[PDB]
Amino acid sequence: KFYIQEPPHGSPNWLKVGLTLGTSAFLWIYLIKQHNEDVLEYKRRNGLE
Amino acid sequence: LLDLIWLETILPKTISLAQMKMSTTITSQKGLIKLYFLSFLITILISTTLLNFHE
Amino acid sequence: MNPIILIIILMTVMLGTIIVMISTHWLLIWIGFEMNMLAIIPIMMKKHNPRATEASTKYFLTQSTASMLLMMAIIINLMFSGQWTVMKLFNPMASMLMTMALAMKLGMAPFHFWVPEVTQGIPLSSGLILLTWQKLAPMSVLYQILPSINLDLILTLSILSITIGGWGGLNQTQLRKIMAYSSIAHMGWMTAVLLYNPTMTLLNLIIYIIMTSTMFTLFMANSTTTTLSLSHTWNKAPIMTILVLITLLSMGGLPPLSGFMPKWMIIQEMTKNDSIILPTLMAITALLNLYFYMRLTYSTALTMFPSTNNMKMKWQFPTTKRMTLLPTMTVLSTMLLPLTPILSILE
Amino acid sequence: MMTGRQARAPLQFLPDEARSLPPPKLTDPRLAYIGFLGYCSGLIDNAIRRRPVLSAGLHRQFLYITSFVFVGYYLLKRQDYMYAVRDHDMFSYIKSHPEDFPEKDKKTYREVFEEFHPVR
Amino acid sequence: LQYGPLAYILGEKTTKKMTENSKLITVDGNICSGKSKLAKEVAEKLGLKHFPEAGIHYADSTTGDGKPLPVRFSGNCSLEKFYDDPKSNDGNSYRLQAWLYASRLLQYADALEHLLSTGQGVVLERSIYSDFVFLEAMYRQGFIRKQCVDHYNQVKKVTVCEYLPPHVVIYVDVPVSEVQSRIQKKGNPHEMKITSAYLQDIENVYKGTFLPEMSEKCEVLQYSAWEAEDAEKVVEDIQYLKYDKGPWLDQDDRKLHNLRMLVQDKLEVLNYTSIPVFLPEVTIGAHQSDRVFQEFTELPGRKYRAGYNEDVGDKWIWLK
Amino acid sequence: MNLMITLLTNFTLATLLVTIAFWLPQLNVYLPFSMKFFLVAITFLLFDLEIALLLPLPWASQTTNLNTMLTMALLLIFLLAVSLAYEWTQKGLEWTE
Amino acid sequence: ARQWQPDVEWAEQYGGAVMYPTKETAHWKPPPWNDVDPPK
Amino acid sequence: MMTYIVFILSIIFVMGFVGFSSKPSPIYGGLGLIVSGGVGCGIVLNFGGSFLGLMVFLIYLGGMMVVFGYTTAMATENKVVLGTFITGLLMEFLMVYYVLKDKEVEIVFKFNGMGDWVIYDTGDSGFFSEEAMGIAALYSYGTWLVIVTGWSLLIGVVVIMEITRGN
Amino acid sequence: MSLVYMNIMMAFTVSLTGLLMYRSHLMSSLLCLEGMMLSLFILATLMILNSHFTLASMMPIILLVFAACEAALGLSLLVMVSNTYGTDYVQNLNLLQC
Numbered sequence A: 001k002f003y004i005q006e007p008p009h010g011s012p013n014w015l016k017v018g019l020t021l022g023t024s025a026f027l028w029i030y031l032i033k034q035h036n037e038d039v040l041e042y043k044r045r046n047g048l049e
Numbered sequence B: 001l002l003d004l005i006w007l008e009t010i011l012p013k014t015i016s017l018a019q020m021k022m023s024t025t026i027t028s029q030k031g032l033i034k035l036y037f038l039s040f041l042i043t044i045l046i047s048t049t050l051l052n053f054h055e
Numbered sequence C: 001m002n003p004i005i006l007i008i009i010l011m012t013v014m015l016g017t018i019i020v021m022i023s024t025h026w027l028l029i030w031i032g033f034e035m036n037m038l039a040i041i042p043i044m045m046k047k048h049n050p051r052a053t054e055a056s057t058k059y060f061l062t063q064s065t066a067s068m069l070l071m072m073a074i075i076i077n078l079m080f081s082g083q084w085t086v087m088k089l090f091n092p093m094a095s096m097l098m099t100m101a102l103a104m105k106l107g108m109a110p111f112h113f114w115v116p117e118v119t120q121g122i123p124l125s126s127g128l129i130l131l132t133w134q135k136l137a138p139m140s141v142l143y144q145i146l147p148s149i150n151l152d153l154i155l156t157l158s159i160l161s162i163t164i165g166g167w168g169g170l171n172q173t174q175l176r177k178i179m180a181y182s183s184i185a186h187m188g189w190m191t192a193v194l195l196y197n198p199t200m201t202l203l204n205l206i207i208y209i210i211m212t213s214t215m216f217t218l219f220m221a222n223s224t225t226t227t228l229s230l231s232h233t234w235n236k237a238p239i240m241t242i243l244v245l246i247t248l249l250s251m252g253g254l255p256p257l258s259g260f261m262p263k264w265m266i267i268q269e270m271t272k273n274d275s276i277i278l279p280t281l282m283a284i285t286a287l288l289n290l291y292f293y294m295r296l297t298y299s300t301a302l303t304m305f306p307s308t309n310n311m312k313m314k315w316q317f318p319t320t321k322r323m324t325l326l327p328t329m330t331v332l333s334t335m336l337l338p339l340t341p342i343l344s345i346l347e
Numbered sequence D: 001m002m003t004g005r006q007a008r009a010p011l012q013f014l015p016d017e018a019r020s021l022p023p024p025k026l027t028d029p030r031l032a033y034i035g036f037l038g039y040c041s042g043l044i045d046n047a048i049r050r051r052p053v054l055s056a057g058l059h060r061q062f063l064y065i066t067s068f069v070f071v072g073y074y075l076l077k078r079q080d081y082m083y084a085v086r087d088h089d090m091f092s093y094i095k096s097h098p099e100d101f102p103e104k105d106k107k108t109y110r111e112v113f114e115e116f117h118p119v120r
Numbered sequence E: 001l002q003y004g005p006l007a008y009i010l011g012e013k014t015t016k017k018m019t020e021n022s023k024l025i026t027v028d029g030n031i032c033s034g035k036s037k038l039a040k041e042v043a044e045k046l047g048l049k050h051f052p053e054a055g056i057h058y059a060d061s062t063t064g065d066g067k068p069l070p071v072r073f074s075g076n077c078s079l080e081k082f083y084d085d086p087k088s089n090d091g092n093s094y095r096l097q098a099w100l101y102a103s104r105l106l107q108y109a110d111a112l113e114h115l116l117s118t119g120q121g122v123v124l125e126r127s128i129y130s131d132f133v134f135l136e137a138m139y140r141q142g143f144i145r146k147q148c149v150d151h152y153n154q155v156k157k158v159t160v161c162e163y164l165p166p167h168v169v170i171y172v173d174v175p176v177s178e179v180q181s182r183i184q185k186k187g188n189p190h191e192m193k194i195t196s197a198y199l200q201d202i203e204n205v206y207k208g209t210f211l212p213e214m215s216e217k218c219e220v221l222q223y224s225a226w227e228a229e230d231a232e233k234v235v236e237d238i239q240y241l242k243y244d245k246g247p248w249l250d251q252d253d254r255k256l257h258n259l260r261m262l263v264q265d266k267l268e269v270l271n272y273t274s275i276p277v278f279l280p281e282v283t284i285g286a287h288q289s290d291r292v293f294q295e296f297t298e299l300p301g302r303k304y305r306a307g308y309n310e311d312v313g314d315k316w317i318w319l320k
Numbered sequence F: 001m002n003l004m005i006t007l008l009t010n011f012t013l014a015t016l017l018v019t020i021a022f023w024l025p026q027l028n029v030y031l032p033f034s035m036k037f038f039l040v041a042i043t044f045l046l047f048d049l050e051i052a053l054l055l056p057l058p059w060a061s062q063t064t065n066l067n068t069m070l071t072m073a074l075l076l077i078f079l080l081a082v083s084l085a086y087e088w089t090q091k092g093l094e095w096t097e
Numbered sequence G: 001a002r003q004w005q006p007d008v009e010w011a012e013q014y015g016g017a018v019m020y021p022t023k024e025t026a027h028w029k030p031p032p033w034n035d036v037d038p039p040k
Numbered sequence H: 001m002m003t004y005i006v007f008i009l010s011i012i013f014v015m016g017f018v019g020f021s022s023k024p025s026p027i028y029g030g031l032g033l034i035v036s037g038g039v040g041c042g043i044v045l046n047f048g049g050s051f052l053g054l055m056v057f058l059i060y061l062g063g064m065m066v067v068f069g070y071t072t073a074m075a076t077e078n079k080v081v082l083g084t085f086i087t088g089l090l091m092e093f094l095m096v097y098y099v100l101k102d103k104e105v106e107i108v109f110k111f112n113g114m115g116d117w118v119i120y121d122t123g124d125s126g127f128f129s130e131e132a133m134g135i136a137a138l139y140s141y142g143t144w145l146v147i148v149t150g151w152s153l154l155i156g157v158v159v160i161m162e163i164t165r166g167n
Numbered sequence I: 001m002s003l004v005y006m007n008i009m010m011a012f013t014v015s016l017t018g019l020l021m022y023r024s025h026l027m028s029s030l031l032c033l034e035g036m037m038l039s040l041f042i043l044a045t046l047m048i049l050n051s052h053f054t055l056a057s058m059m060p061i062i063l064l065v066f067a068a069c070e071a072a073l074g075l076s077l078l079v080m081v082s083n084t085y086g087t088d089y090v091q092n093l094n095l096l097q098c
């Protein structure tokens, strides 16, 4: 060891890292799904297909 | 005379002294609730009778 | 304070402001203000010392007086209109009384005299609530009654707030009074553009809330309530001096920063309406605000004041304070000017 | 100004007519700037907590970038919608009030007399 | 953090763990009272956690690798140079006293954090309530100035008000002649330079100022040099105390929650030790401050937050 | 009108009896503040406002919106009870319980 | 020849009750550090 | 004279306000506000507001001014007051004299000087008091109003117990 | 307009100028504040009864209740002020000038 007291951030909070990566991946797939649905609705309403 | 005194006196120094003096007049309040509400009453009387902000 | 009781009381502050924002009846506006004042009194008396009791008493007296003037304006509106809809008022006397009452609740000059006292008397988190969240409900009422707001009254209040808030902060060394006079000047800027374009009122309100929340969060993160204790920050946390530097330069409205965004748009809306003298003198008067912001940047970031020996102990301990949204708020308070046309989302 | 326009259908962040508009591209430079602001927030978050700035918490930096891009995409959609509404109202008002917007007779500079001011 | 408002809401009350043995006991005495074993003896009879007396390098023992830092990074002051040159020009005397007050403040915060998080009582040696009896004993000897006493009283006025006093204060009566006999038997060549008037001033501010003011807010036990040798009599006296004074009686879960929130935030504990009072004994100018800060950051394990230092072998930093 | 006459008569009789009692025997020659009392007065005031909310109930039972009326009546008496329970458990009703 | 940094004399100008002490605001002392006044 | 009874009670109402607002002592100020509350109740009763007038007696005078006089008795135990009182009295009776000699006045608003019986309705309400029915509709129509008022009173209990504790 | 409204508004302005001109006591200020409330109650009540506006008959009660709760809060502040200085004098509340 090095430290005389075990630090709070000596080991990674794996629950919080998992929630972070899962939330970020969810927001990316929801953003890409929203964007594809929006370009499809734009092309449907304006007749560009 | 000019570029250490008078051109220094007329634009920056007199402006700075004026803002200092206005700052000390605005912030010389005695912390009394009585005087602030008396100023609020004088504000309402000037707004109604002297400025006609209610018409 | 019990944390559950703190959560219920903060939700009640929020509920009072939300009731003001969502209601169509004047009695529910007045109820939202009463609920908000009643719930925010314990937040000011959180630490139980005579300065907090004095600040809460002064706050109670000013907000209760404004609440009675508000109810008299509502009652005169009911005389001359027979109804209670939160819309334009149907009497100029009721319009004057409601504008006075809302200016007292905002602490706009010449009803500004409680804001530095009450802000100084209370902790930094409760002064954060007072200078940001407590502006939201009266500005929303001013938003809805602007077809009946007298122009000369609201512009007199605006320029008087900008000048008095500029000169008031020049004499201050306490950080809470600096933020209070800065608040008075920024509310003057918000009401000056209100009858011309209330979207710019909302823009100035949002940018002010972001920058003021940033400065209060930095002050809480460094435990500093004076200029001279803020000057120790370089020897303890040198990143915090850079953050207070960029945020104070932004609050001065210096481009390319985000606090240049409101006043520019405000001038952009006041010259379309052929008012040229007024935004000119307003912008020149805001140089007073920039002067005492620059005073704080000189003492904190651009020079190194002398420290003490016991500071060496605080080098061995990290900041365990939850600096909630401080990097996000610091980025939004400084780097937002390239996204200036985002303001149309407030329309 | 446009507050009675969005008052028959209140509290809609993006109304249904906003779907007639092309959405911002994901390579929108405004959206790339908002992602850059998320990256700067992640760096300041490492800096104020005395973490190594570029290296520590890459999951946290990526959630900063992702959350700013996510919020900013919808903010840009609403921005473009409101300027489209502004122009739609402008053009419909000009089309419905021709007496207020006459077609001005454009004159060529052979008829236009301008006063000459010599620089001498 | 580990403890906060959420853990208090989700059931963690400190009166569940506040048993009868959860007592903060401070042992006091003069420079060679021999209290240092007595305290340990009490902590091995009542089952309490013993904290040794906070010196210059207490904060060094609580942070980093636990090893003492070089004296320019912690202290900037010497006890031995105080013993050699008490009236020195560089201001070692009050700088040493102010650093020791900050160290005892940190130690009292550690003791209250252990007591309020575990329910185990703590035996201290010369807490922040008894630190001032050196200060006045320096000021009565002309070792420090009146301005140094004013600075000390400002820092004490805004720091000690936030804490609870100990439950038991144990004092050890040892006369100045026996103190000097034990100093000469100790053999420390610096500590043998202590005058008689300084030790007599320590005893006078002990008996005339400290013990009268701690007799109201807690329970003072006072022993001579020979009756403090029997630890069983001292522990018998502690176990048969009827606690009826001081502000420990009116401590519910809310007040002790607020106190535990205070004593786990060490920068908030150490906030007002560095107040901007520009006293020449404690003021460090900006060039020395900058230079010693940047030398402190280059120490191993000290550049970043504790879990974030590759040079001392911290892993998974890109996921922290 | 009869009520104003009756109030005037009761006030006149009371003032006449007080004037007799203060001037018929003239013929012959011959604190530290207590927080507890203030708290019980404020608790009276707050529960008295809650009672003022409860006073139109004999008229409110005549409505055709009885499910809503019964819900709001029970909710007001319940919030008076929650005020009492908070006053109880936070030691507000102590030493004058 | 090194860079000037503020001395104690420069820094004491920012520790007063106000920034510009006049005749009226000369009895003003700065507030307490923890903002707690004694109960008198 | 009896056709002006609401006006006479309103004169006594303003006289009571000049009484306590000149602030002789908070106990005499409490007495002046009590007398004012009684005569304002009488005004409300003469416009047919029986329940609202009895709320002035039960809640304002019997509930709130009791607590004011109580706190005043626990806390307490001139020339400006008398001059202010005669000033407000002379201003009020100059208002009376003008609006009686002219049957019209304009201080800020225009005011008729006839007896205020003239504005009333000339019908009946059948077998109910309309004011009683509108107050009874707080439970049927005023659901959100009941919610926000009861929540504010519960919060008021909590707030008084927070700020009076000192801890 | 009708003649009683003149006096109820004048009562409001008299109690307003009483509340905007303090003498010494905080209690006298709270009495002027509740006089302002009483006049608002009476004026609201006379309008609502004159108009036969039925649903607004519950409005002055609400105006009473909230404001008396407000008054309760004010009394508590006064008491805490009176637990600091011995009196409720407004001139003792001047620490926040600096």
Ligand SMILES: CCCCCCCCCCCCCCCCCC(=O)OC[C@H](COP(=O)(O)OCCN)OC(=O)CCCCCCCCCCCCCCCCC
Pocket: C010, C123, C125, C126, C128, C129, C132, C133, C136, C205, C206, C209, C210, C213, C217, C220, C322, C323, C324, C325, C329
């Ligand atoms: C059209 C507009 C409609 C409305 C839009 C939204 C408006 C938002 C207004 C924001 C006002 C926020 C006020 C602060 C939060 C309220 C509660 C509070 O103060 O919590 C802080 C809390 C208290 O900690 P405490 O323990 O009391 O501190 C004493 C020392 N231990 O903890 C702390 O002190 C921790 C320190 C950090 C706290 C930072 C909080 C930042 C919140 C504001 C973010 C920026 C504003 C939102 C974005 C823009 C919206 C306009």
Ligand SMILES: Nc1ncnc2c1ncn2[C@@H]1O[C@H](COP(=O)(O)O)[C@@H](O)[C@H]1O
Pocket: E030, E031, E032, E033, E034, E035, E036, E053, E055, E079, E097, E100, E134, E135, E138
């Ligand atoms: N002003 C002071 N003068 C001398 N010793 C001090 C002073 N302040 C604290 N001490 C400590 O008190 C110790 C003497 O007690 P002891 O631990 O029994 O030797 C010294 O070794 C120092 O660590």
